[PDB]
């Protein structure tokens with residue numbers, strides 16, 4: 001009962017690119033770029049695709065950085081989210097009807113306006129650590145329980 005997702009963070013030495021979703025699941029929040037993995041597509045191909053479609057950027061090298069499973073109480077389907085990072089992009093970010101991308105200084109990451117779990121794992125991502133995580137949600141704002149451990153292999 002888990003569905004594959006990707007999430008991609010474009011992380012440079014002094015800044016990170018986040019996208020503000022204008023509509024649908026996660027609307028109103030800053031987040032990385034991602035979505036459901038498709039039939040006949042690898043997780044990494046999915047990650048690269050999601051980044052292009054949502055941000056307009058071209059990425060070559062994607063690095064695995066974590067796996068997070070999300071549980072929403074009362075929803076049968078679990079989210080199995082494969083998180084990736086990259087430093088090497090091509091293109092300039094594109095604002096669309098679906099997504100407003102913006103760069104953030106690493107000290108000005110807008111956690112109050114991000115999924116609440118980000119406050120836990122994003123500092124690991126920033127210090128180039130790899131992680132396995134699980135977050136149980138009630139609704140979209142409340143973390144009931146969670147586990148988060150660093151790992152050598154994602």
Ligand SMILES: Nc1nc2cccc(-c3cccc(Cl)c3Cl)n2n1
Pocket residue numbers: 005006007025026031032033034035036070079081115116117118
């Ligand atoms: N950073 C982050 N934390 C969460 C928690 C629950 C769901 C989602 C989420 C919502 C929409 C699309 C995608 Cl790929 C994801 Cl991971 N995200 N994203």
